[PDB]
């Protein structure tokens with residue numbers, strides 16, 4: 001058995017990667033250790049940038065059905081929300097979607113697209129050479145080996161693949177330990193949403209609702225499986241009461257360990273999601289970071305296997321993604337100190353609350369957390385470069401159409417604004433990789449795109465080239481060659 | 489011997505207070521423990537707001553002669569300067585002026601103004617009643633007692649007066665212990681500007697040039713009442729860096745901590761506190777001297793008017809109400825810096841996120857306004873946006889050409905600035921002519937001005953605005969503002 005790509009792990013990163021690779025025509029195999037999907041949710045939502053990418057893929061409507069919209073974001077529980085309304089987006093909020101549902105949506109899509117999913121199959125070894133990768137698998141039908149051009153480790157924080165490769169995972173050892181419980185409580189919870197601060201103990205309890213009458217309770221202590229008795233002991237020792245907790249849906253530990261893989265690639269093997277970055281779950285960023293790693297990698301790897309990509313393209317995945325993960329680790333490492341109730345961090349907490357009240361400071365952190373502000377280094381001076389395209393209302397014949405409906409196939413899009421057509425002929429040699437979207441104009445005059453006549457957008461929604469009337473066609477062919485490969 | 493005010497301590501807070509009180513006609517006595525002024529400098533400069541206040545008093549030119557202008561400010565040594573150019577000021581910078589020079593300038597002025605300075609005289613006890621204060625003094629000719637209406641403790645962080653009064657000094661215990669030495673080093677200093685990092689030891693050595701070939705050397709240890717000896721600084725240096733680096737020509741030695749405390753109150757009857765006497769914090773961003781100097785400018789005119797018996801009785805109370813939150817803000821930002829300078833790799837994300845935030849213009853401006861004190865806003869029950877803010881040094885167009893607004897504040901009287909041919913304001917303020925000067929201008933020589941939509945402003949002797957009129961508003965509230973800050977009509 002020979003496949004183009006083998007993916008180890010069917011978490012949200014692996015599943016999105018499988019979808020992206022199928023859009024790019026790669027024969028994909030997804031191997032999942034667990035026999036059945038997990039029954040608890042780690043992540044409780046998706047941020048504004050993930051919603052935009054699901055919209056671009058025509059998956060958005062499926063997630064939004066689970067309606068709850070969080071218009072403000074959390075930054076180290078300081079009481080000053082991260083306002084997402086300040087953004088040029090159709091989704092100025094985070095969506096409350098439990099991971100179990102996110103994974104069910106992505107599984108449906110990956111299967112619909114033709115990705116092969118093998119649940120109960122684990123990767124134990126790997127062998128690499130110039131030609132390909134041979135992966136050692138153990139499944140319910142016994143051990144076997146599968147050949148591929150590329151293997152991707154989407155196997156979580158304890159990633160087997162990362163360790164198999166010998167990739168170092170540098171970072172920081174934890175300074176905090178917490179126990180989590182998704183449970184019901186007979187007694188009434190104290191207000192704090194709920195919780196008890198304990199500066200003396202250097203600990204805190206905090207709870208918030210999941211669904212009516214069910215809470216996620218956390219007990220954090222600063223400087224083996226967790227059992228109900230652990231959570232009850234911890235709850236009693238900090239809040240002073242058991243609270244009559246019953247029917248625990250999930251129990252687990254949590255730490256502020258902060259590590260990133262030294263590299264995201266080692267020959268024909270790549271890492272994505274928790275496999276290349278672990279951090280304190282603060283501000284709800286991991287699933288989104290992993291999902292976005294997949295969207296960046298998927299089209300680049302698919303084009304590499306198709307043999308249409310420039311050889312330096314797959315390398316841009318680590319170059320673009322490492323700083324983004326670095327930024328999540330940086331802000332979470334900052335939050336980890338900020339949540340430590342040690343009175344030593346009071347000036348720091350108070351100065352942060354003040355800075356959070358400064359609009360541009362609030363917007364800078366909101367753009368980080370929501371990922372609406374991700375900027376990749378890109379050739380040129382125009383501000384829009386390396387940035388996402390907004391979901392523009394476009395005017396055409398047969399009415400107005402949203403720019404995101406042109407990205408379902410995960411091809412690049414050359415968006416023209418006006419009667420000028422020497423652009424269509426110059427890009428015709430890339431017609432097989434890029435679609436020309438010829439609009440009369442933008443249905444809204446406000447638009448970040450207004451001074452422009454043309455944009456070249458990558459399959460991930462990131463702009464790589466712009467034309468204004470003065471500029472005219474220059475760098476187009478260069479941008480096409482850089483991101484999509486040689487002409488016809 | 490009877491004086492209106494007795495000041496304990498001739499540090500920069502005490503000296504500015506003496507100047508201010510003399511402008512307000514108070515017979516002032518300044519008692520200094522040291523026989524001769526100190527030949528070293530703790531502070532190395534003055535921030536933009538202090539320069540504006542020296543300008544208002546006609547002292548500005550004396551400080552600026554010692555030219556070095558620092559257009560950027562430090563924030564926990566993060567490499568991202570606090571840009572002061574973003575401010576509507578004539579001094580968008582900090583001045584490099586060593587404390588010895590600042591004190592020499594203020595002493596010259598206080599003496600010129602007739603304040604009595606007694607060097608080698610220390611306050612040991614105090615007795616207070618409804619009528620006044622009796623202060624116990626020990627000087628070179630022996631002990632004595634002096635009577636006054638008010639005593640002010642400007643006696644530093646270890647303030648004798650604060651302790652005499654029983655005022656609690658709440659705050660936080662140190663987490664950092666460091667030694668400072670202004671010295672010359674025979675050996676070459678390693679790159680840090682200069683210094684050695686020691687994560688294992690959870691300490692660091694740092695140094696920066698004071699003048700060519702002279703450095704301020706700091707050895708900090710994270711997580712010592714006795715005065716530092718030269719050997720102590722050599723030991724600290726040697727523990728961290730392996731060597732003392734040929735240390736000689738020791739100008740100064742000192743201990744330093746991140747102890748962060750503020751006096752529960754700034755007043756206890758007829759006794760007041762100002763400067764280090766009511767607030768200690770980690771010296772980070774160079775804020776203490778400026779905070780103390782600004783406490784003096786706020787207190788001086790209010791106390792002088794109280795002794796003159798022209799002030800409303802609730803005026804002296806506005807000193808603590810206005811100053812406490814300002815000092816609270818310095819302690820807050822310095823408590824934040826104290827963590828940021830701790831070498832534990834645990835604070836890396838925090839340091840890195842702060843550098844990023846410092847690159848956000850409005851975040852940079854918010855901290856720059858804090859540190860420079862250009863953004864100090866006092867609560868005014870009133871609702872116009874300039875209320876409680878400083879007046880910019882406006883170029884004024886008048887008869888006899890253009891004149892700067894700061895040249896009208898030399899006497900430390902209030903100023904009623906009018907911008908227009910409308911004179912129903914001069915008659916309405918005539919009963920306060922003895923406390924407030926009418927500055928009648930044709931307009932502002934600059935279109936930019938924060939004052940552009942206004943026709944009139946009432947400014948306190950400290951340069952803080954307390955009343956405004958726009959063409960629509962007209963005269964409403966002048967008499968109330970005059971009564972609130974200057975007292976009843978004459």
Ligand SMILES: Cc1cc2nc3c(=O)[nH]c(=O)nc-3n(C[C@H](O)[C@H](O)[C@H](O)COP(=O)(O)OP(=O)(O)OC[C@H]3O[C@@H](n4cnc5c(N)ncnc54)[C@H](O)[C@@H]3O)c2cc1C
Nearest residue numbers: 009011012013033043044123155156273274284286287288
């Ligand atoms: C308490 C908590 C709350 C969080 N809240 C949020 C939030 O609100 N928002 C957010 O964005 N993120 C949040 N996160 C982070 C988020 O849950 C993760 O970042 C996300 O699950 C990572 O997805 P993944 O696919 O990379 O890895 P995983 O989800 O860990 O899945 C990897 C998969 O690989 C499989 N596997 C492992 N070893 C092998 C092997 N040898 N062979 C084959 N398969 C293997 C595993 O069975 C697993 O299914 C939270 C995390 C925690 C702990």
Ligand SMILES: Cc1cc2nc3c(=O)[nH]c(=O)nc-3n(C[C@H](O)[C@H](O)[C@H](O)COP(=O)(O)OP(=O)(O)OC[C@H]3O[C@@H](n4cnc5c(N)ncnc54)[C@H](O)[C@@H]3O)c2cc1C
Nearest residue numbers: 497499500501521531532611643644763764774776777778
């Ligand atoms: C290392 C270091 C660097 C600094 N850098 C800066 C900087 O660049 N910028 C800045 O703005 N600030 C800086 N500061 C802070 C600044 O030096 C102080 O805040 C400032 O000196 C306070 O002035 P003061 O008049 O309140 O108190 P002090 O300067 O301490 O003087 C109080 C005076 O009272 C006298 N006295 C004490 N007891 C008695 C008594 N019983 N009777 C009579 N007199 C008495 C003392 O002799 C002394 O002269 C720094 C401080 C340090 C330690």
